[PDB]
Point group: C2
Chain length 383, copies 2
Amino acid sequence: MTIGIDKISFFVPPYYIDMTALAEARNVDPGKFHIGIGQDQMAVNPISQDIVTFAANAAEAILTKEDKEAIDMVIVGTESSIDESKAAAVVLHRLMGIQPFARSFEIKEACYGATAGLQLAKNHVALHPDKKVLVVAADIAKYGLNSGGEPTQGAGAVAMLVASEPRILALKEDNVMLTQDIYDFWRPTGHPYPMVDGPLSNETYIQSFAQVWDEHKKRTGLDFADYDALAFHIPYTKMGKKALLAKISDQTEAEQERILARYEESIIYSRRVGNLYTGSLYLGLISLLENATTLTAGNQIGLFSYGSGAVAEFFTGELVAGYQNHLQKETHLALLDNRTELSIAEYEAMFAETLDTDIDQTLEDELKYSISAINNTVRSYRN
Amino acid sequence: MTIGIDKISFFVPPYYIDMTALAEARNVDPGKFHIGIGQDQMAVNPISQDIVTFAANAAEAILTKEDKEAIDMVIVGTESSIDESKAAAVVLHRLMGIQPFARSFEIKEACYGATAGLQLAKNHVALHPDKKVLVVAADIAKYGLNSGGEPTQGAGAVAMLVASEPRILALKEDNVMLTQDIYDFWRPTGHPYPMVDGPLSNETYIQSFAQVWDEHKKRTGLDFADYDALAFHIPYTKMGKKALLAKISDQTEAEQERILARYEESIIYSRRVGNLYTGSLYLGLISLLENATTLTAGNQIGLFSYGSGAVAEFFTGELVAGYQNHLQKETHLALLDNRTELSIAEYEAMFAETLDTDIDQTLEDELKYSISAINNTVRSYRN
């Protein structure tokens, strides 16, 4: 029995700011964002939209009644939580109408959370093939106006229906994971914005990939030639390209052109969204599935998942025969095309606004699953 | 292949306050805490001791060099986190000296976290029998001085080595889990103390046990008579007794006496510690193993795990032949008996004190793994 991703979909807010507008507002050369970071459009979200808002819309795009009855585990991976005790997965479970006898919880490990949930979900289904697990990555990435990280900001969520005899991606058991206590990025309790050691984040991300890849090659003998495509967690485009470059230098010129071509295909939707933290890698994978014209059934996909602090893991997935018929390109393309472009002024009004959870209030937002009210610090959602 | 808990241990801070002292200082009848709540001594911890401090001491009590090399996953369950991104499991992985190639993350679902980690660990080992997983519950439960929940406070951690062919407890596949979005207890980001609906927390905990127990009975046909002992998560002693009572009303007078007698044996250590949230149920299981003179190999043990907001799950375990030779009774007792009793004036000074993570400073504390210093919000530990 094969196990893996049966359905996948992402969701992003109805708002975005174009990088050239940002460059100009920050008195720099449009090129620095388009050509340095490798970013074009950033996702922007108002206070009435949180991780439940995204996780709910994303999963609502792939769940059927039969899925609601088979799912016995819901997992949310995020490093943008709203409660320190109650898991957002409990509210996702209610809003999605999933049957009651299920286990729900949140997993926290920087941008690596959703990968953890997915592998644990793979194990669960492998042991109970009739059951399914909903693994959703949801995050909001803010660094601060005029911040060093500002151009790498993003927001959204990616939902995965994990089952046996999957229709899109059958996961293998070649996992190589690594844990290292490094303070490249962190956020002490109480800190709205993360603490960032930029250079350390850079080196650690590039090195973690090297170490994990080498071990995997050492344990499985598989090299770049053996992979049709590679999907990466990335805080921004140019980063995964630098990590990719550093490792493929000794491959043939043609082999390098092929791997980079495929990397470029994996970051199409990301260049229009930004960092989704836990869902970054998954957004890359969705991209590869919907935009990569030369992939086909049977091809091998390498996945490098990273989490600051730092955790990292490399694993493989195989294209399932007929996968091309169970994607959501369209809804994904409409989703992106239909967003409203905020001017820098609008964008800043939206970014700086706070949601004071202690104050009772009502919020208006047309988006389904967005926050409708707050009473005694409890959020209500507009379903 | 049986899979389960091979070794377990708990750790609590070196101090405590007598519940009679608390009642007198709070102008309340000693018996309200002693009988009402069913608590005798509360675990108190200073600022220099956090979730890492406990999780490390606990695990250090059961890890061998061989265990450090076989463990490929480290999981910490808590609702007392110190970082919103980086999982305490990463620091625990470093302090414990576990081999590098491991997956490390934190799980958040109120007091249900560690139970999630144990089950997923079970799955992992079932699939990779030569591997072991370290699952540790670590939490600090504070409600505030002169709080309604004050007498139910606690602090500590319980560590579990999950492996195949376990020496203490072999886990069955009879799990009945449940998820319900209810605000009985939660803690919005930014809130040092939880928001608590007492009556709702009460009814929800009792009703969850009922619903879960009935379902397990409907699916397996097993009733109370079939169990040699039951272990419960409990915010306090009298709670699990009230939940136990509401469900065993129609059993024989002799059956009720036996189940209660066994329940009383599960709460011996808890009456001297208080609420460990995630590790509460596990502290009860350790108590049963170390205090229950009549238990023996092959006896069945049902465990009821509850986490606020609210998830619950009922599963069973069987005592493995020779389990009596792989427990830590002396160390545990030595841990409880050798603690320093604080006067209420001392307890109040400890409790209120805060750790300003933003201020770089040093900290002196004799406990191994307590915080030694803070620099740029990064905690260093005394190893």
